[PDB]
Design a protein around this ligand. Sequence first.
Ligand code: KAA
Ligand code: KAA
Lengths: 310, 297
Amino acid sequence: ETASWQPSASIPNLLKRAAIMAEIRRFFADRGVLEVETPCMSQATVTDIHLVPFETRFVGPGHSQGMNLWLMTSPEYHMKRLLVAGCGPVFQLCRSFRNEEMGRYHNPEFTMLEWYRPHYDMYRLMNEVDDLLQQVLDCPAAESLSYQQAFLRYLEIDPLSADKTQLREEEDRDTLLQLLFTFGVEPNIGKEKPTFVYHFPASQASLAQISTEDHRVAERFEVYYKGIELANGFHELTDAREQQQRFEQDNRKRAARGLPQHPIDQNLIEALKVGMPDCSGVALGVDRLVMLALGAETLAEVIAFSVDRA
Amino acid sequence: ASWQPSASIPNLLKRAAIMAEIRRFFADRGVLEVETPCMSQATVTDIHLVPFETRFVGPGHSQGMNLWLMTSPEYHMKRLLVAGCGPVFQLCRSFRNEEMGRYHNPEFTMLEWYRPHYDMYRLMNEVDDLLQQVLDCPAAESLSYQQAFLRYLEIDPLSADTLLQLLFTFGVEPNIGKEKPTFVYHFPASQASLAQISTEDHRVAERFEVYYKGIELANGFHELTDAREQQQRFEQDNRKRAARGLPQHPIDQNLIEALKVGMPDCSGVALGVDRLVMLALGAETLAEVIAFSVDRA
Ligand SMILES: NCCCC[C@H](N)C(=O)NS(=O)(=O)OC[C@H]1O[C@@H](n2cnc3c(N)ncnc32)[C@H](O)[C@@H]1O
Ligand SMILES: NCCCC[C@H](N)C(=O)NS(=O)(=O)OC[C@H]1O[C@@H](n2cnc3c(N)ncnc32)[C@H](O)[C@@H]1O
């Protein structure tokens, strides 16, 4: 429609977005959470099987042949390194990068709000996220639903026990579960108020600690509202050995799927060996939250220049 | 060990305070904060810059596309000005493919802002006010490029180019900004960059840089708004690159088309926040004020 040179977001939306950013900063300042800035580029990347990071070449030091750098998909690894270093509760409003096509709710570069809370367990963190959503969105308090309960209610099936065959009614169980969640659960939740889905299957623990009450589940949660996935958080895994092992598992799964394997970030593992204080952390997509807050129809409407015009 | 941050936690705590202080400074003046892309389908032709390059999968149907990391958010901020954003600033992460150094990191934080209807002196006064506040340093001194040469090297630059830059670097920089920041303005028209060339003296451009304690802190211009002249300079840039065996870069058509529509008269300036924080905290290297310098990232 508009000529390419124009921003995809209206001037009024840019002003309203700036107000929301300041509101988010006040929210954390009032709770004593320190703001930090970590790298957008790294010598390492993530093994998470669902992400495709951007790659770029750096001239490197002195007389080097040069070196590959990956753009950061989320500031998590560096923030955990800071936690081990004693930074205390911290948040960050950074630009994050993912090599994936632009969509109504996706841009290859987007703003992430990610923060960590030492001594907070998963529920405690969820309540804080709930507070932030109610404030900037002026929406009602959230509903919380366990992954298992979500499946039973909308698909009349138990994801923690259901048979592979039953699920089909793909030999990889999690892909099957994610398929069912994407088309069978997601479209039905967060309609009247934000929905927190917690206690994902152990296999989808990512960097979250496994539940002490039920080994089949991980202390991970995701927030959905008005059809948009808004956040993803964990009671963080502090065991370096298990973390190293999960990254190895990631690469095995990548390989078996014909996906490139990624180097394991040794800086994250060495930090975890030194010791990360027990904590829970969460990452929320700021553009999506702003889009909902401003009544926008697409992410592009709240981003100065979506990639198609950048 | 390698896992540790390059900046101390206390420095990170003080850096956040300075960032908040910078935001208050602009809020108090009614300057809007904006966030533009870190990646673009175009890049800069500026002969001295080496941008990072990355590949984007793009639309599922396409063959993908090349993207360039932004060396400064100038082009997008200028497009916003044409769209009517008014006075704006940005605290973004900027990228330049250059070796890590005592005063350089391939990714650093830029404080860049634009002031509609401000001539370059009015804008310099504002930069001066910011330095005073953040560094608690004396008000700055201002020297024209000509005056700076005529007194530190007894020679008239406007009547006497890579040479000048070699002279400025060794014959001027070393003795300016010692007791207070030093603004050097009216650089040779030859080094106008995206600045208007002065109509009172065609031998100079309306551009300035500010130095303090031996550190180059900022670079600003009374902005060139003529689309045709800007396009000509970019082509000039690429011919020089070709002459120097450097790659020729695609010119940002969106910037030119926006300038065709009309950008309000304005002045803009880009400042290195990491260098500013380094001075504020009395840190020795940029690495000491950045959570993880590239060697550790
Ligand atoms: N340690 C606890 C936090 C871990 C966060 C984890 N590393 C992570 O990235 N989770 S995420 O779900 O993949 O991303 C968080 C949010 O980022 C937002 N996101 C992700 N990709 C995009 C894109 N491409 N555009 C816009 N927004 C996006 C979205 O709201 C997600 O809920
Ligand atoms: N429209 C008016 C402003 C134009 C600014 C122009 N695009 C520009 O980039 N000027 S600059 O001098 O190249 O950059 C401004 C500041 O960025 C800082 N800078 C530049 N490169 C680096 C690096 N590599 N590390 C840290 N800081 C850096 C430094 O303080 C410079 O004074």
